[PDB]
Design a protein around this motif. Structure first.
Motif, PDB file in Angstrom:
ATOM      1  N   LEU B 131       0.849  -1.214   0.000  1.00 23.67           N
ATOM      2  CA  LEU B 131       0.000   0.000   0.000  1.00 23.67           C
ATOM      3  C   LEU B 131       0.877   1.254   0.000  1.00 23.67           C
ATOM      4  O   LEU B 131       0.439   2.275  -0.580  1.00 23.67           O
ATOM      5  N   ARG B 132       2.053   1.189   0.620  1.00 23.33           N
ATOM      6  CA  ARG B 132       3.026   2.309   0.639  1.00 23.33           C
ATOM      7  C   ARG B 132       3.417   2.622  -0.800  1.00 23.33           C
ATOM      8  O   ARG B 132       3.188   3.765  -1.255  1.00 23.33           O
ATOM      9  N   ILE B 133       3.877   1.609  -1.518  1.00 22.54           N
ATOM     10  CA  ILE B 133       4.344   1.724  -2.923  1.00 22.54           C
ATOM     11  C   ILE B 133       3.198   2.291  -3.771  1.00 22.54           C
ATOM     12  O   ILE B 133       3.444   3.251  -4.561  1.00 22.54           O
ATOM     13  N   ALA B 134       1.984   1.800  -3.534  1.00 25.35           N
ATOM     14  CA  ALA B 134       0.772   2.183  -4.278  1.00 25.35           C
ATOM     15  C   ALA B 134       0.449   3.648  -4.008  1.00 25.35           C
ATOM     16  O   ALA B 134       0.022   4.335  -4.954  1.00 25.35           O
ATOM     17  N   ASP B 135       0.607   4.099  -2.763  1.00 26.95           N
ATOM     18  CA  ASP B 135       0.275   5.491  -2.339  1.00 26.95           C
ATOM     19  C   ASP B 135       1.136   6.461  -3.166  1.00 26.95           C
ATOM     20  O   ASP B 135       0.579   7.372  -3.785  1.00 26.95           O
ATOM     21  N   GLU B 136       2.441   6.193  -3.231  1.00 30.62           N
ATOM     22  CA  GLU B 136       3.455   7.011  -3.937  1.00 30.62           C
ATOM     23  C   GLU B 136       3.216   6.960  -5.454  1.00 30.62           C
ATOM     24  O   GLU B 136       3.559   7.935  -6.128  1.00 30.62           O
ATOM     25  N   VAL B 137       2.689   5.856  -5.984  1.00 22.53           N
ATOM     26  CA  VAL B 137       2.384   5.731  -7.441  1.00 22.53           C
ATOM     27  C   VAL B 137       1.329   6.788  -7.807  1.00 22.53           C
ATOM     28  O   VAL B 137       1.537   7.511  -8.808  1.00 22.53           O
ATOM     29  N   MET B 138       0.260   6.888  -7.016  1.00 17.62           N
ATOM     30  CA  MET B 138      -0.860   7.842  -7.251  1.00 17.62           C
ATOM     31  C   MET B 138      -0.353   9.282  -7.044  1.00 17.62           C
ATOM     32  O   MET B 138      -0.764  10.171  -7.826  1.00 17.62           O
ATOM     33  N   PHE B 139       0.506   9.507  -6.044  1.00 19.44           N
ATOM     34  CA  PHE B 139       1.073  10.843  -5.713  1.00 19.44           C
ATOM     35  C   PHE B 139       1.865  11.362  -6.918  1.00 19.44           C
ATOM     36  O   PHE B 139       1.676  12.528  -7.295  1.00 19.44           O
ATOM     37  N   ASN B 140       2.692  10.501  -7.509  1.00 18.21           N
ATOM     38  CA  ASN B 140       3.564  10.822  -8.666  1.00 18.21           C
ATOM     39  C   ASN B 140       2.712  10.955  -9.947  1.00 18.21           C
ATOM     40  O   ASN B 140       3.163  11.654 -10.873  1.00 18.21           O
ATOM     41  N   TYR B 141       1.546  10.303 -10.013  1.00 18.74           N
ATOM     42  CA  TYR B 141       0.643  10.330 -11.195  1.00 18.74           C
ATOM     43  C   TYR B 141      -0.213  11.603 -11.159  1.00 18.74           C
ATOM     44  O   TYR B 141      -0.207  12.337 -12.163  1.00 18.74           O
ATOM     45  N   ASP B 142      -0.953  11.835 -10.068  1.00 24.39           N
ATOM     46  CA  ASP B 142      -1.862  13.008  -9.927  1.00 24.39           C
ATOM     47  C   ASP B 142      -2.014  13.380  -8.448  1.00 24.39           C
ATOM     48  O   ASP B 142      -2.578  12.575  -7.686  1.00 24.39           O
ATOM     49  N   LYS B 143      -1.582  14.596  -8.096  1.00 21.85           N
ATOM     50  CA  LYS B 143      -1.568  15.131  -6.712  1.00 21.85           C
ATOM     51  C   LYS B 143      -3.015  15.287  -6.221  1.00 21.85           C
ATOM     52  O   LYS B 143      -3.258  15.008  -5.039  1.00 21.85           O
ATOM     53  N   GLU B 144      -3.932  15.726  -7.093  1.00 22.84           N
ATOM     54  CA  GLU B 144      -5.363  15.970  -6.741  1.00 22.84           C
ATOM     55  C   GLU B 144      -6.009  14.645  -6.345  1.00 22.84           C
ATOM     56  O   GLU B 144      -6.707  14.612  -5.310  1.00 22.84           O
ATOM     57  N   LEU B 145      -5.801  13.609  -7.161  1.00 23.26           N
ATOM     58  CA  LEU B 145      -6.385  12.260  -6.953  1.00 23.26           C
ATOM     59  C   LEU B 145      -5.803  11.668  -5.659  1.00 23.26           C
ATOM     60  O   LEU B 145      -6.589  11.160  -4.851  1.00 23.26           O
ATOM     61  N   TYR B 146      -4.490  11.825  -5.438  1.00 22.79           N
ATOM     62  CA  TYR B 146      -3.794  11.449  -4.180  1.00 22.79           C
ATOM     63  C   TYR B 146      -4.546  12.065  -3.006  1.00 22.79           C
ATOM     64  O   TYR B 146      -4.907  11.333  -2.071  1.00 22.79           O
ATOM     65  N   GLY B 147      -4.797  13.365  -3.079  1.00 23.09           N
ATOM     66  CA  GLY B 147      -5.488  14.127  -2.024  1.00 23.09           C
ATOM     67  C   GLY B 147      -6.905  13.638  -1.805  1.00 23.09           C
ATOM     68  O   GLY B 147      -7.347  13.618  -0.643  1.00 23.09           O
ATOM     69  N   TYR B 148      -7.615  13.318  -2.887  1.00 22.74           N
ATOM     70  CA  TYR B 148      -9.035  12.885  -2.864  1.00 22.74           C
ATOM     71  C   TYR B 148      -9.133  11.563  -2.097  1.00 22.74           C
ATOM     72  O   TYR B 148     -10.145  11.359  -1.361  1.00 22.74           O
ATOM     73  N   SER B 149      -8.117  10.694  -2.247  1.00 20.80           N
ATOM     74  CA  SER B 149      -8.040   9.361  -1.589  1.00 20.80           C
ATOM     75  C   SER B 149      -7.727   9.532  -0.102  1.00 20.80           C
ATOM     76  O   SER B 149      -7.997   8.587   0.664  1.00 20.80           O
ATOM     77  N   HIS B 150      -7.271  10.728   0.297  1.00 19.83           N
ATOM     78  CA  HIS B 150      -6.860  11.068   1.683  1.00 19.83           C
ATOM     79  C   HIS B 150      -7.798  12.124   2.319  1.00 19.83           C
ATOM     80  O   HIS B 150      -7.527  12.518   3.465  1.00 19.83           O
TER      81      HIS B 150
END
Lengths: 315, 307
Positions: B131-150
């Motif tokens: 899940l750590r690796i997955a979290d950083e994948v979304m962060f590097n792909y789209d910051k907004e989507l990363y934030g939406y998941s959090h």
């Protein structure tokens, strides 16, 4: 004494060989007895038969899982809350109540770890072809009869109970695509609460012969019993177990329904199970896995039952 | 220069990684996360999939990734096809036979893609390191989507947030292993989205909530798949990803003022009404609550307040 290899053994008497689509799910009704055998095999600080599965996990992950399962618990006398209670200077009666609550919490937390890592092992090895191969040979080397029982050894050719089982407990598409994958059987058997099913079937006048087979294969068959205390208390909430629930669905294949085809009563055992599961919210939920339309089929079946009863009175 | 995750703020997140209720909520984006990993496969190599190598036995990750992205074995080499061409049939019978072989060749390949996709997601998204690796994948792909998941920049006293974590999670299951299967994973997975949307659109109590759901599923670009391979894998037009997006979009519902009239959780009861009128969805409800028909009866039969 030189051990008989699996590839040497007959396998001509098995009506459900490894290669049968319906085998993986049926074998997984013995998953708790398989865990029991792997845990029994740990002699002195070795992980025993667990090591034969190391290829199916990332390097060193297998050893972690095995330990988490067999590792002795830390003493409850070293629990931080236990130590605080015994130093707090409480009235004797209150102290002893508090101590028992800390002791129960301590065992429960250990059970939660053991179940978590048991399910991590079983869900990895028993849903993979290569892993089922290893599991098949482990059971063969443990007990030939149990190996046979998991494969329907010496079962008659035209067994009508076997056809009903294949038809109602598997989805045709799911079992065709990936036999080693999750099947309806794994969902229903896993969700069911066997003790309440055993009570209602015992009260069913239709299912008297079937209850006798269930009682024997669950309580009196020696190789349907767990050998370790560790796995026994892991599955127990006089006391029923998750292994006892699976052993009921395992035992179903023994039911005799060849002669009842003439009177159209050959699926009486299946509808008897439905009537034994519709009563409590846990088993009721388990039924919706078995068939999404079970309540509508139940009312139909009781319409026609009432329709036949009426024509019979006019005599 | 690389904007590392360790450096980022993360102070506005009401649902951080460390939250018990995060793993299940993140896995509503599991079909979008597969889509992201498949986007990254460039010069006949596995792209972002390789970042998960350590979570499988050596080589296993390579096989699984392939089975997901690789081109299928040519149907001109299927053993039945070879026998059709050798049988010397009438042209019209040959071509009809060939189409029966073609159709199951495609279906078998859809089933293999789906199987190995499910094997990847189930291994990496229910383990902490995964899940750590997955979290950083979304962060590097789209910051907004990363934030939406959090839940980035979400109110502190938000009531739909408290209702969501009370009804879609079991206290003991979520405390024992947050990363493990939760009610939410089971309900969202079994649910048939298209039917639930249809009943809520006909529900007068839920009018504000449907407008949020219709936007986050059809209009929002970040909650849309970019790859043909995944969108075509989840097609029965509706998809499995659109069902999961409906559960994801619930955090946007404005229910705080309806607390006084004790209708603050009308969206939850409206959802139950929306998925009780067909066999598949009502089977999905039995995951949400084992006692739901008795709770629905006593809640929707109190017409003594209508007097």
């Amino acid at each position: 004494p030189t051990a008989i290899r699996l590839e040497d053994y007959d396998k001509s008497k098995l009506r459900l060989p490894f290669e049968s689509p319906y085998f993986p799910a049926y074998f997984r009704l013995l998953k708790w007895k398989f865990l029991d055998v792997c845990v029994e095999s740990t002699r002195n600080n070795d992980i025993g038969y667990f090591k034969l599965f190391e290829s199916l996990f990332p390097p060193g992950k297998l050893e972690e899982i095995a330990r988490m399962i067999i590792d002795e618990p830390t003493p409850v006398s070293h629990d931080p809350d236990m130590i605080k209670i015994r130093n707090a200077d409480l009235d004797v009666k209150i102290r002893k109540q508090a101590e028992t609550y800390v002791t129960l919490r301590h065992a429960h937390q250990q059970k939660v770890q053991r179940r978590r890592f048991s399910e991590c092992f079983l869900n990895t090895v028993l849903f993979d072809e290569k892993g089922l191969r290893i599991a098949d040979e482990v059971m063969f080397n443990y007990d030939k009869e149990l190996y046979g029982y998991s494969h329907w050894e010496d079962l008659p050719d035209g067994w009508l109970t076997a056809e009903t089982f294949k038809n109602k407990f598997y989805d045709e598409e799911e079992v065709t695509n990936n036999p080693f994958g999750y099947q309806k059987l794994d969902r229903v058997a896993g969700a069911a609460r066997g003790m309440i099913i055993m009570k209602h079937l015992k009260s069913n006048p239709r299912c008297v012969s079937e209850t006798t087979i269930l009682a024997f294969e669950v309580f009196n068959k020696g190789n349907h019993q767990l050998s370790t205390d560790l796995v026994e208390d892991l599955l127990t909430e006089k006391k029923w177990s998750l292994h006892k629930t699976l052993t009921m669905f395992l035992a179903i294949i023994g039911f005799k329904s060849n002669d009842k085809k003439e009177k159209n009563e050959h699926e009486e055992w299946y509808y008897g199970f439905i009537d034994a599961m519709k009563n409590d919210p846990a088993n009721r939920a388990a039924l919706y896995f078995l068939d999404k339309n079970w309540p509508e089929e139940l009312e139909e079946r009781e319409k026609e039952r009432d329709r036949i009863r009426l024509t019979l009175l006019k005599s």
